Amino acid sequence: NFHPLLVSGRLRIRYHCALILNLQKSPFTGTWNFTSCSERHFVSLCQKYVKYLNNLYKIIPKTLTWHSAKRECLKSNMQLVSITDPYQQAFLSVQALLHNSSLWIGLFSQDDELNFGWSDGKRLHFSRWAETNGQLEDCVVLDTDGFWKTVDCNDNQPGAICYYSIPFQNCCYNFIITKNRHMATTQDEVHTKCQKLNPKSHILSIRDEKENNFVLEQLLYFNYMASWVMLGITYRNKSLMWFDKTPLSYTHWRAGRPTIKNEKFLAGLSTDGFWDIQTFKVIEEAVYFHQHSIL
Amino acid sequence: RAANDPFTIVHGNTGKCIKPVYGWIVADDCDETEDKLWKWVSQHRLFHLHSQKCLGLDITKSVNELRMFSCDSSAMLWWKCEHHSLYGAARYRLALKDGHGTAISNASDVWKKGGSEESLCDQPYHESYGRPCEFPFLIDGTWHHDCILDEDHSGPWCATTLNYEYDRKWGICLKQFNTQTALSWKEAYVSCQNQGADLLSINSAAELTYLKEKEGIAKIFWIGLNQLYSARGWEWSDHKPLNFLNWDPDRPSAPTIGGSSCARMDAESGLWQSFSCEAQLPYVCR
């Protein structure tokens, strides 16, 4: 369970010890970090051979449809499951595994499974979808693997559960959703790419401190398949700089002193703002570079 | 009159009132008295009328959960009122955390009744030989709080024991010469004040002579002649003039020591003997 955003994986050419990190109710709670383990940290779980987190849950083992289960357990003034927190998702998944079945979860869309939304009326802050080529209908279920399988819920599952409880800072951005296949010479084309659109248009450069939080809050809007963030740091003049002829002031390095001499690398932005650099040996990480990423 | 009435407990700062769910407490959804009803029952307990489930404190783990419990169990359930708050088991206040009630022993919380300034504790608890009823009680597998009417008895009937299933001793819901009902004079007075009436006040000889020939009456009972005020001699329940007395010649009638501070009426000859009325005996109050 190593999410490829905080660990550099390549041809590897002072001990190392890992740990689990929490980010105060983050959509990626449970990440695995690695550092030197000579320091002092905490340990809580040790492995040997219904109310939950200010919420209430009720499970029914009846085999009924989605509307039917809603009308069934709604008589007791209860609303179907709507996952909005990582701990709630983990508890729902462990309860489904203890019940040994895939139970109902409650939501509905409006226009051809394009705008998904819970029945509570809260802004989307959590996304744990399973696949991209599975969105055949406009409903979802929880599987064994703990993901969100996009299916039709006009069927009979062995149970149900229901619960109770852009211009910004003198710059304009843009998002491109197209399909591309150019996998060569990716260091002398982006400038002429954005310059053809309109004059006085340069690649995204960070000259402030509030733009990071702004683009972070803007990111989690269409993140069904988007999980990584790209940056404009590449091989420039035998150093790790931008594309334009301008020096760097805000350092975006993780730790130590990187010495990447390759023609390109992966400068990534984390979930909370951890500066991350990943040296790549295969070019099969470009999905994720130009099709459904931030350009 | 002075009797217990169903009410609702609401928070002062936030417009939230208590709503029970299968085993816990939920958000307000208030201003509708079709389901949310609470009342006071013996041993200083709170009882829900519709759900028939009472609340208690089960101190067993590090974090004591405030769930629902059965009113017939060893749950040690009772609640009292502090100057502007509620404290339960051991200085444990019903703290609110925006939807659920827990016990964190915080000194910043207020609780009032529905749409009126009151500490919801100014009215004290109000309630087979005419013994007082026991509320609540489990009959037919369900909890009941009031003397309901059925087709078995004439009118309302209640239980006179904590466990009616093992004792099977019922009684009449007393809301008047109650013969064979031996109670204490203080108990008789508090029960007749619960009904809003007062003890017998004899003003003329006509009523007394009418009571002499009465057949359906005990030969020995109380009248209510007692000195609740320690600085005056003898008064009645209400403020009636003292002009008619029927004292006894046999006893020397010691004022305070040697005798007692209560009166007992003998109707076979019409005398008023000095005695202590702390024991059980029939009575009559108008």
Curated annotation (Swiss-Prot), chain A:
Record note on modification: N-glycosylated.
C-type lectin domain residues: 52-164, 168-291
Give the subcellular location: Membrane
**Summary of the tissues where the protein is detected:** Expressed in spleen, thymus, colon and peripheral blood lymphocytes. Detected in myeloid and B-lymphoid cell lines. Isoform 2 and isoform 3 are expressed in malignant Hodgkin lymphoma cells called Hodgkin and Reed-Sternberg (HRS) cells.
| Disulfide bridge map | C17-C37, C139-C153
Sugar-modified residues: N33, N237
What does the UniProt function comment say about this protein?
Acts as an endocytic receptor to direct captured antigens from the extracellular space to a specialized antigen-processing compartment. Causes reduced proliferation of B-lymphocytes.
Query: Which additional comment does the entry carry?
Result: Isoform 2 and isoform 3 are produced in HRS cells by a transcriptional control mechanism which cotranscribe an mRNA containing LY75 and CD302 prior to generating the intergenically spliced mRNA to produce LY75/CD302 fusion proteins.
Q: What name does UniProt use for this protein? A: Lymphocyte antigen 75
Please name the gene that encodes this protein: LY75
Q: Which residues of the full protein are shown?
A: 1035 to 1378 of 1722
Swiss-Prot record, chain B:
Q: Which residues of the full protein are shown?
A: 30 to 341 of 1722
Would you tell me the protein name for this molecule?
A: Lymphocyte antigen 75
Q: Please indicate which superkingdom the organism of origin belongs to.
A: Eukaryota
Boundaries of each Fibronectin type-II domain copy?
128-175
Q: Where's the Ricin B-type lectin domain?
A: 4-127
The disulfides recorded in the entry are C133-C158, C147-C173, C192-C285, C262-C277
Q: How is it modified after translation?
A: N-glycosylated.
Q: Which residues are glycosylated?
A: N106
Q: Which gene encodes it?
A: LY75
Q: Note on file?
A: Isoform 2 and isoform 3 are produced in HRS cells by a transcriptional control mechanism which cotranscribe an mRNA containing LY75 and CD302 prior to generating the intergenically spliced mRNA to produce LY75/CD302 fusion proteins.
Location in or out of the cell: Membrane
Question: What does this protein's UniProt record list under function?
Answer: Acts as an endocytic receptor to direct captured antigens from the extracellular space to a specialized antigen-processing compartment. Causes reduced proliferation of B-lymphocytes.
High-level lineage: Eukaryota, Metazoa, Chordata, Craniata, Vertebrata
Tissues of expression: Expressed in spleen, thymus, colon and peripheral blood lymphocytes. Detected in myeloid and B-lymphoid cell lines. Isoform 2 and isoform 3 are expressed in malignant Hodgkin lymphoma cells called Hodgkin and Reed-Sternberg (HRS) cells.
Q: C-type lectin domain location, by residue?
A: 176-286
